[PDB]
Amino acid sequence: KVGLLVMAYGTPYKDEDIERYYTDIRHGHKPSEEMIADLRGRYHAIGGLSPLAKITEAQAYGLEKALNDSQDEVEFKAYIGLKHIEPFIEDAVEAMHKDGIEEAISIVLAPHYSSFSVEAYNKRAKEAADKLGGPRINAINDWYKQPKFIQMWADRINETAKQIPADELLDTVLIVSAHSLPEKIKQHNDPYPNQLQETADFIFEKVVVPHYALGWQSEGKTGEPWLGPDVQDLTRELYGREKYKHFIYTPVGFVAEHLEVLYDNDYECKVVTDEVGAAYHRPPMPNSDPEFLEVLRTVVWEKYSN
Ligand SMILES: CC1=C(CCC(=O)O)c2cc3nc(cc4[nH]c(cc5[nH]c(cc1n2)c(C)c5CCC(=O)O)c(CCC(=O)O)c4C)C(CCC(=O)O)=C3C
Ligand SMILES: [Fe+2]
């Protein structure tokens, strides 16, 4: 019995939860009434709440099933550890410990590594284990190089492009993005930006879309520079220069439909394409598709074999 520590951001379960959730994201500093109002407005604009909770849950337990049905060397037990709402990363580790688990493999539901994302996940999990006395946490840092991951995204882009008139494929561009971070991470050799570039490069080689570009989205409310260009700004620039007629958005930094896709892409990017007169395309997120469960199953088993 090896625990499967599946970690993700988390999302408010109820509208009452919005305040403490934002407070946790802001490292305990309660946001103003104006910032809360904006956030609740965005959740309202996408229907009320994000489906991130149910998707994350199907992902974690679909992985556990996928691993357990494909071999009998080991039995896996999935525990969900969220970053900004319960159950927290530390609650999962405590749950693993009280359950007697001696060893566990941890994976973050985000394929790319960064000091701000995976590193924070791995740090909190290792600190909770050390304090508790177990289990031993064998962490996966990234997995965007998994061939099946690259292929799954190329298949989605290819399926969408096949519905674009050949008359217009030459005027179609693929926009590859992930959640922005403070630009300062580039001063210390953070791999995050280069991992995203590699991801876009690998996908581009396997799709019929002849143009592409790397953007970022969802940069925070601070006073510092963030990784750019923003996908909205990139969309305008690319239209001004090439007059592209089709924009295909794949935020490969995310693995599920949630606020940062349903609003930041399906609304704000759509607004831009509408403004310039181009078509908006955003292929389905991985969610809990068997193909994606197969991606995660391969990554975890590869990590176990090592
Ligand atoms: C690297 C990264 C990922 C990668 C994926 C992962 O790690 O899994 C990610 C994912 C997500 N981030 C999410 C939501 C939010 N992130 C915020 C704010 C921030 N994220 C940041 C970073 C990241 N975020 C940072 C550095 C801030 C600024 C904090 C500050 O201001 O000091 C805010 C606050 C308001 C705003 O900035 O808009 C919200 C609401 C949701 C789910 C939303 C839902 O569906 O409920 C998901 C999956
Ligand atoms: Fe975030």
Author numbering: 4 to 309
What text comes from the article?
In the "68% Fe" structure (resolution 2.1 Å) the best refinement solution was identified with the ferrous iron being present at 68% occupancy. Interestingly, in the “68% Fe” structure, we observe a continuous electron density from the distal histidine (H182) to the proximal tyrosine (Y12). Ring A with the substituent p2 exhibits the highest distortion in the “34% Fe” structure (+12.6°), +9.2° in the cpIII structure and lowered values for the “24% Fe” (+4.8°), and the “68% Fe” (+1.9°) structures; in ring B (p4) the angle is altered the most in the analyzed samples (−13.4°, −10.5°, −11.4°, and −6.7°) as a function of the site occupancy by Fe ions, exhibiting a high degree of distortion compared to the coproheme structure. The measured change of angles throughout the ferrous iron insertion process at the site of p7 at pyrrole ring D is also peculiar: the rings in the substrate‐ and product‐bound states overlap well for all structures besides the “24% Fe” structure (−2.1° in the cpIII‐structure, −1.6° in the "68% Fe" structure, and −1.4° in the "34% Fe" structure). In the “24% iron occupancy” and in the coproheme‐bound structures, the guanidinium group points toward p7, while in the “68% iron occupancy” structure, being in a split conformation, partially points outwards since one conformation is 5.4 Å from p7. The residue points toward p7 in the “24% Fe”, “34% Fe”, and in the coproheme‐complex structures, but points away (5.4 Å) in the “68% Fe” structure. Nevertheless, a definitive conclusion cannot be drawn as the ionic radius of the ferrous iron in the “24% Fe”, “34% Fe”, and “68% Fe” structures is larger than the ionic radius of the ferric ion in the coproheme product and would result in an out‐of‐plane position regardless of the side from which it is approaching.
Coproporphyrin ferrochelatase (CpfC) in the CPD heme biosynthesis pathway incorporates ferrous iron into coproporphyrin III (cpIII) to give coproheme, which is eventually decarboxylated to yield heme b by the coproheme decarboxylase enzyme in the final step of this biosynthetic process (Dailey et al., 2017; Dailey & Gerdes, 2015; Layer, 2021). Understanding structure–function relationships of key enzymes, such as ferrochelatase, is an essential precondition for the design of new inhibitors for antibiotic‐resistant pathogens, like Listeria monocytogenes. LmCpfC crystals in complex with cpIII were soaked with a ferrous iron solution and flash‐vitrified after 2, 3, and 4 min, to obtain snapshots of the enzymatic reaction during iron insertion into the porphyrin macrocycle. We report three crystal structures showing different iron content during metalation in LmCpfC, identifying the presence and defining the extent of the porphyrin distortions during iron insertion.
